[PDB]
Amino acid sequence: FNCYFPLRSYSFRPTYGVGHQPYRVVVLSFELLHAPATVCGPKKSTNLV
Amino acid sequence: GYFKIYSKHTPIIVREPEDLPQGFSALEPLVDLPIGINITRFQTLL
């Protein structure tokens, strides 16, 4: 008592409503540095006429 | 920024000491590493 340690826990049970049923969140943070670009979007191609 | 390596393997027949061969061989590029790191000193590994 009187030492409320900062780690707590969740109590997910499979009959909760929205807002309390757990969600899986991931963030894809992009950055532009002085290094050459290594990750980039896809570049689709066409046929060879 | 880019780091390039040129190389060519040649079968020398000339003896080993002080004989850099008197010929011509054009070194071909192998890879092009897209690093962003400055380089001032280097050392070989054996």
From Swiss-Prot, chain B:
Residues glycosylated per entry? 38
The impact of changing residue 26 to V is:
In strain: 20A.EU1
Q: Which domain of life is it from?
A: Viruses
Upon changing residue 38 to Q, the result is: Increased resistance to neutralizing antibodies
Phenotype for residue 19 to G:
In strain: Beta/B.1.351
Q: How does it assemble?
A: Binds to host ACE2. RBD also interacts with the N-linked glycan on 'Asn-90' of ACE2. Cleavage of S generates a polybasic C-terminal sequence on S1 that binds to host Neuropilin-1 (NRP1) and Neuropilin-2 (NRP2) receptors. Interacts with host integrin alpha-5/beta-1 (ITGA5:ITGB1) and with ACE2 in complex with integrin alpha-5/beta-1 (ITGA5:ITGB1). May interact via cytoplasmic c-terminus with M protein. May interact (via N-terminus) with host bilirubin and biliverdin, thereby preventing antibody binding to the SARS-CoV-2 spike NTD via an allosteric mechanism.
Task performed by this protein: Attaches the virion to the cell membrane by interacting with host receptor, initiating the infection. The major receptor is host ACE2. When S2/S2' has been cleaved, binding to the receptor triggers direct fusion at the cell membrane. When S2/S2' has not been cleaved, binding to the receptor results in internalization of the virus by endocytosis using host TFRC and GRM2 and leading to fusion of the virion membrane with the host endosomal membrane. Alternatively, may use NRP1/NRP2 and integrin as entry receptors.
Protein name stated in the entry: Spike protein S1
Origin species, per record, is Severe acute respiratory syndrome coronavirus 2
* Name of encoding gene: S
- Which part of the entire protein is covered? 199 to 242 of 1273
